[PDB]
Amino acid sequence: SLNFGKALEALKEGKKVSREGWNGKGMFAYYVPGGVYEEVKYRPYLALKTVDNDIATWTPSVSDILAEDWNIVE
Amino acid sequence: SLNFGKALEALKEGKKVSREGWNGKGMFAYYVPGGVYKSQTDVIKNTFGEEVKYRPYLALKTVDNDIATWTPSVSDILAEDWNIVE
Amino acid sequence: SLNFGKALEALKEGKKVSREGWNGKGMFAYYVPGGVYKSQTDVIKNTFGEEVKYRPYLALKTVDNDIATWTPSVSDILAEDWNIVE
Amino acid sequence: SLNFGKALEALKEGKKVSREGWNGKGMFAYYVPGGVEEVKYRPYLALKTVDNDIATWTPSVSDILAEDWNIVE
């Protein structure tokens, strides 16, 4: 049971995190670093592997930020 | 300058936080505790019940001295330029 | 099944909206209007002023019968499975 | 002066949109279609920011409620 601050550090280190309140085992969020792609530089962002096994751009809600039921998933 | 994890700690303790670009704009965020409010109208009771419980949330004083119930953006969460503002 | 543009118009009209694709069932979002209120202490008046204007925002009745501040995700905005809930 | 519902339709039709309240010339958002052991990614939104960098953008509630959107040519 971690707060969002330590879950954010885990994200910035490349780890996967999830919430017990999400009610979705298999769901995890991860951090995508920024990069340069006549060259375009992309900002870092957060992503989520959903229950539909697809990738979606993720923005934490206020409940996610205030929650203290975070866990690091392998 | 602090990361968002330490800024969230100051928020939960009743302090005000702000990013570097917000000073001069009068902007800061603060934490509002949750509560329980009693329903008055039957239409409110028929949808929410006799009582309605609100979760804790965050507020943000904008540049116009008006208050917005705030959801931090990804750039705010990934930023490391937060400060405790007195 | 509506897109988010028509669900937003329903929100601004005071209606409640929900998505079929949401895993949590029984949830809906609704529109909270803005307001202006009187300050009750010197600490607020010396930081805000006499009147505090509050911006409108969106709330979500969760599966716990709780009220949380809500910001739609990108998937919510692009989805076309919205309906008005009575 | 369009609301977000018509700006979203312009996004889904491949157009660029921006706000007046953004108070930033050159900033615009656009729609990126979804696509593809193998990983499937959903369609999302991108924003050309103030420093010529591209971010994966989610509209704030103020952006969704604002009615100052335009189509950027």
Side-chain angles (χ1 to χ4, degrees), chain A residues 34-43, chain D residues 30 48-49 51-55:
Chain A
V36 177
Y37 294 82
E38 294 177 336
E39 277 303 277
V40 45
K41 188 160 86 96
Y42 284 82
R43 287 186 177 181
Chain D
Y30 59 98
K48 179 263 176 69
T49 72
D51 288 359
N52 220 258
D53 47 328
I54 303 294

Side-chain angles (χ1 to χ4, degrees), chain B residues 16 28 30 47-49 51-59 61-71, chain C residues 16 28 30 47-49 51-58 61-71 86:
Chain B
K16 313 178 188 63
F28 59 85
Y30 59 97
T47 55
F48 295 97
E51 89 180 11
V52 47
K53 179 158 87 278
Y54 288 71
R55 290 181 178 178
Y57 63 91
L58 302 173
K61 175 196 169 189
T62 77
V63 297
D64 308 321
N65 287 27
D66 51 351
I67 303 307
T69 78
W70 181 51
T71 300
Chain C
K16 295 136 51 195
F28 59 81
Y30 60 97
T47 288
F48 303 89
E51 293 296 79
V52 278
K53 184 169 60 180
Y54 281 77
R55 291 184 174 182
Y57 68 99
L58 303 176
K61 197 220 90 295
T62 69
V63 308
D64 307 327
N65 255 6
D66 269 352
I67 299 305
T69 55
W70 184 63
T71 292
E86 304 180 21

Side-chain angles (χ1 to χ4, degrees), chain A residues 4-53:
Chain A
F4 185 72
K6 293 172 182 174
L8 184 61
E9 281 184 5
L11 288 166
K12 295 180 178 179
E13 296 167 41
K15 298 176 178 179
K16 317 173 192 130
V17 302
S18 62
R19 274 194 58 204
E20 302 158 358
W22 278 354
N23 301 334
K25 297 184 177 182
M27 258 177 67
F28 63 85
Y30 62 95
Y31 168 85
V32 182
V36 177
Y37 294 82
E38 294 177 336
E39 277 303 277
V40 45
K41 188 160 86 96
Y42 284 82
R43 287 186 177 181
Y45 66 97
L46 303 178
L48 178 83
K49 173 255 158 229
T50 76
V51 302
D52 300 329
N53 201 260

Side-chain angles (χ1 to χ4, degrees), chain C residues 4-72:
Chain C
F4 184 75
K6 307 188 181 186
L8 178 65
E9 271 186 11
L11 286 167
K12 295 178 178 177
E13 291 178 354
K15 295 160 182 164
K16 295 136 51 195
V17 296
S18 180
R19 284 190 56 206
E20 313 177 46
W22 283 346
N23 293 118
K25 295 314 198 304
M27 305 185 306
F28 59 81
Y30 60 97
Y31 178 85
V32 185
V36 182
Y37 315 96
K38 297 240 211 179
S39 300
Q40 320 286 60
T41 192
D42 296 356
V43 170
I44 291 175
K45 296 177 183 61
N46 290 320
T47 288
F48 303 89
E50 163 54 44
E51 293 296 79
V52 278
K53 184 169 60 180
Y54 281 77
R55 291 184 174 182
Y57 68 99
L58 303 176
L60 184 88
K61 197 220 90 295
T62 69
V63 308
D64 307 327
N65 255 6
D66 269 352
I67 299 305
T69 55
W70 184 63
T71 292

